[PDB]
């Protein structure tokens, strides 16, 4: 299996500038030209929502302020400008090796 | 449109067995996999097992091997989770998710409401 | 100056026996700088994992041959497939020990496979030899339609080609079938009574059950089966007096190991006297070319004529099999297997015991019942065969001739017109004339009965193509005779080469030729 | 409308690039592909690559195309297919070799033609050039019994009246005590051969020494002996007709597009009957209600009938007839239609065997004219596409239109008094002729 790790566990950033989150994987998750990594956002009391798939392509129906990039065993997610949408937790899921695993979560304020 | 619905909350004495029903009402039920997930109180997620309603093939995770059973009925469009020998660590929320067959990854798109069990 | 001999055996004790056998075989030719060494492993449950383990472990040690042991599991045979494929990629010879299926004889697929036990097809030779001794010359062959069944059928047909005789019938059922009574009825309708069977244990049990239901185990029936059909459930439910076979020391794993090691060592030493010798490739990864001298080593292995063996001299035929194996001939005497003979390498030597046949008779039975009720077929000629409608219902008006001879008549059932005119109208009629008098004389002399019926269409018979499959077929009376709807064509039939090739005529009863009719 | 995650796997020697493989409409279902290129394969690299491809995505098919000449890759692919339940297609190189018997539970289909289809094409050539007297030389290479049985059954059910004089099997070691007598028995002009490329050299050398190779005798061999066209031994005479596969005009991109089309069409047709599509195994390691066999017997794609037979072969392959010209290279002559055969050379030319050490003069060109009852001209019977057995072939140059000088050599049938005289002279003086009617005018005037 692959074990993910998100840093920082808890982040507090002022509204307006930016916010950065990293999720480093234990092993390479590249699968013949397409890195496998997805990001989630889950409001409390609600199921999580898909944001980014393939670590570089944004999901239809989401604001353009959300983006992600990375390669190999290191990936990062940055959002700008900071607004009232980035209040929930975030998770990173890998799909290179069965079974699929999730991260530790990170809230913003 | 694809919509998924589950049962209500559960609360039994420790040592019992519970069933969770997931109903698919937006597509051809005998064509897409159904995955189950467990969420503890806000410190992570895991993976339980999946079932193809059409052929009936089933896959399980090693940790949950022999503890949970997945059965599905092609007539009622229902997926049944069979928990056995509940303990103090089984208090969690259970989701049923289904992907869409259009991409090369294996992502989770449509999510259920989720049921909370307590021992 | 070392030579390795790998071997994929089943038990650790068997591996120890293999190592000791190699060490002992080091001495028979002496222990020079050339010294044999042994490397073995065990079987694994997953084919894909085993096909990697063989490559890594055995090939990384530059082996010269591989031995397979075929552990006993419900997965049946097809266990040495992963070894044969990987070793045949590099043309490294493989010696089988207990696997007996017929697929491995095909050298197009398995390129470098030799084995010391004959497959499931030489039972065909044993059966053909036993047929000659007991003078049986009509058999009904029963085949499973699988590869093993097709191999057995082809072998038996090739053997019978020399006599230029054809087996009476060859029925083919489907593996794992549930109901076979439909085929067993058509088997019953035939003259012959020697039944030859070739199928797995489940199919053997099912056919035995159906035979018990249809009561086909009485006097005159002779059963003749293989090795598989007298084990397990087939032997559990088997009619008495059934004659099977067996292989002597065919499950003697230690004896087979010793024979194989001896043959390999002798072949290697014989090859050492020759030159132009390379060394086997090393590692599964990075090497793509074949072993240069692999075909030469395999040719040397094939050409060996061994002398000292547990089961005697072992020599390999053209396909890379075993020759001259001593079988045993058993008889199920009151639900017990008792030997009633032994099959010599090329002859049959009966024992002194008693052969109780299925009925219980102590005398050998002959199954060939001739059909004493024939189906004659005839046509409407002008002066030979007249056709007359019946009087009231299945009765013929009894006329008189001018010589005082009452006209002899017999009821013939036929149609009124052809298919475009009369789709289906079959009504009894009355037939009399020249050929009918001849038929009555023949029937009186030969002591048989008959049933005269006319031919569906109105042609004597020619060969004409069909649209699909682009093939030629017979029609008319000849087509009715060859298809089995008739037994004798009492009609004005000409003698010529095209018909003589496919049927047998008699001496002519009328001489004539062709002429022209005109109007005057 | 779920998609298929087909994986395309090719070799380095081909000029195909991964970008083109990933880019390459019209398919009934969407197909996203995964492409990797690798050099010469080995029984462990194959398995490692295949197991890696099945981890991370639910692979639903495979298209394997190679470049080498090793005939164990086909068997390895069949074994992997039967162990993992993945429909595998053969395309090029090693995988295109035809394997006779496959496991009943394997879904491995190949592009290529079997010995029956090659025999049919060879007999068609012989019929089209009026070579009705022939022999048959086969060694003990596997499959010779199938070859002989098929040829016998085909001859027994024809309209042309083949005269198959001999059926020879050289079973010994070319000991010259029996093989020499056997080869002396042959006196025909057309010989079909069936042996491996190593035995073919020995047999052809023996026949050349005996005198069986010349301007007259014609040899026809299957694709078994005329294998890789880069390696041409020195004992092959110039003029050796053989049947092979179409490696000239069939582009690899066309091959991979047709593979994707077949897989997508079969999956689409199977989605209607049952609402689930077949899928690969969970993993290679560890520890089939419905299969695709019934859904690949009838499939149509752009008018091209891509149906597979009930045994695992293509219904309509693309064979090509090749000959070895005087330059010691295999040159394509005619191709194979859906059913019939087209030939570029209407009149079969004469090729100089070896160094043409003995030039020919027995072949003559003869000119005649129609004047009954001495010469009678009739059209060719279309029922058998052959002149009736009491006539001899001719040819006449008829211009299509008067505006241009281009025309066709129409082939007819001739008979009469002078023709009987000519056949008697040919039988007695022992020569061969090339009859053709005159076009310029009547008998003669200055
Ligand atoms: C000899 O065989 C043994 C197997 O017991 C193996 O460990 C060893 O490496 C071999 N040595 C040589 C020189 O082949
Ligand atoms: C059962 O066996 C008897 C033997 O006397 C035979 O006459 C009878 O026909 C058999 N039953 C059937 C249904 O054929
Ligand atoms: C066993 O077979 C061998 C053939 O190698 C033969 O010589 C021997 O006589 C047989 N044993 C018998 C017939 O008892
Ligand atoms: C296959 O690829 C390279 C480049 O084509 C070739 O030179 C070499 O033989 C192989 N390399 C590896 C790492 O297998
Ligand atoms: C294949 O299916 C098509 C459906 O349009 C049908 O027209 C055709 O006759 C079928 N062919 C066979 C051989 O069944
Ligand atoms: C297909 O075969 C038929 C029958 O011989 C023929 O009429 C037709 O022209 C062929 N089609 C092609 C494209 O050659």
Describe the structure in brief:
Chain D: It is found in: Cell projection, Dendritic spine; Cell membrane; Synapse; Postsynaptic cell membrane. Chain A is mainly beta.
3D structure, described in words:
Chain C: GO terms for molecular function: amyloid-beta binding; calcium channel activity; calcium ion binding; calmodulin binding; enzyme binding; glutamate binding; glutamate receptor binding; glutamate-gated calcium ion channel activity. This is part of a larger assembly, with chains A (109 residues), B (119 residues), C (520 residues) and D (446 residues). Chain A has strands at 4-7, 10-11, 19-25, 30-31, 34-35, 38-42, 49-53, 57-58, 66-71, 74-79, 89-93, 107-108. Helix content of chain A is 0%, strand content 44%. Chain A is an all-beta fold. Chain B is 0% helix and 39% strand. Chain B contains no helices and eleven strands. By secondary structure, chain C is an alpha/beta fold. Chain C has helices spanning 12-28, 47-59, 81-89, 123-133, 147-161, 181-188, 201-214, 232-236, 253-272, 294-302, 434-446, 476-482, 497-500, and strands at residues 2-8, 35-41, 63-68, 94-96, 113-115, 139-143, 169-172, 194-196, 222-224, 243-247, 327-332, 337-343, 348-350, 376-378, 385-389, 410-415, 426-433, 452-454, 463-466, 471-474, 488-489. In chain C, β1, α1 (12-28) and β2 (35-41) form a beta-alpha-beta unit. The N and C termini of chain C lie far apart (106 Å). Chains in contact: A-B, A-D, B-D, C-D. The C-D interface holds C 45-49, 51-52, 55-56, 81-82, 85-86, 88-89, 103, 106-109, 111, 147, 284-288, 290, 318, 465, 470-472 and D 40-45, 47, 51, 68, 70, 72, 75-76, 79-80, 83-84, 99-101, 140, 142-143, 157, 284-287. The complex binds 2-acetamido-2-deoxy-beta-D-glucopyranose (6 copies). One 2-acetamido-2-deoxy-beta-D-glucopyranose (NAG) is lined by residues 2, 4, 37-39 of chain C.
Binned, the helix content of chain C reads: 25-40%
Sheet with most strands: strand arrangement of chain A: 1-3-10-9
The helicity of chain A comes to under 10%
Helix-strand sequence of chain A: EEEEEEEEEEEE
Please tally the β strands of chain A and state the result.
12
Tell the overall outline of chain A: globular
Structural class of chain C: alpha/beta
Instruction: Compute the number of helices of chain C.
Output: 13
Main beta sheet of chain A: 4 strands, antiparallel
Radius of gyration of chain C: 32 Å
Please tell me how large the radius of gyration of chain A is: 13 Å
Q: Structural class per helix/strand content of chain A?
A: mainly beta
User: What oligomeric state is this?
Assistant: part of a larger assembly
Content of β-strand of chain A? 35-45%
Biggest chain contact: C-D, 33 and 28 residues
Q: Bound small molecules, which ones?
A: 2-acetamido-2-deoxy-beta-D-glucopyranose
Q: N- to C-terminal separation of chain A?
A: 32 Å
Quote the beta fraction of chain C.
15-25%
List how many beta strands of chain C DSSP finds: 21
Which sequence of strands runs across the widest sheet of chain C? 2-1-3-4-5
What is the overall shape of chain C? elongated
Extracellular side (chain D): 1-446
GO molecular function (chain D): ATPase binding; calcium channel activity; calcium-dependent protein binding; cell adhesion molecule binding; glutamate binding; glutamate receptor binding; glutamate-gated calcium ion channel activity; glutamate-gated receptor activity
Protein name (chain D): Glutamate receptor ionotropic, NMDA 2A
Family (chain D): Belongs to the glutamate-gated ion channel (TC 1.A.10.1) family. NR2A/GRIN2A subfamily.
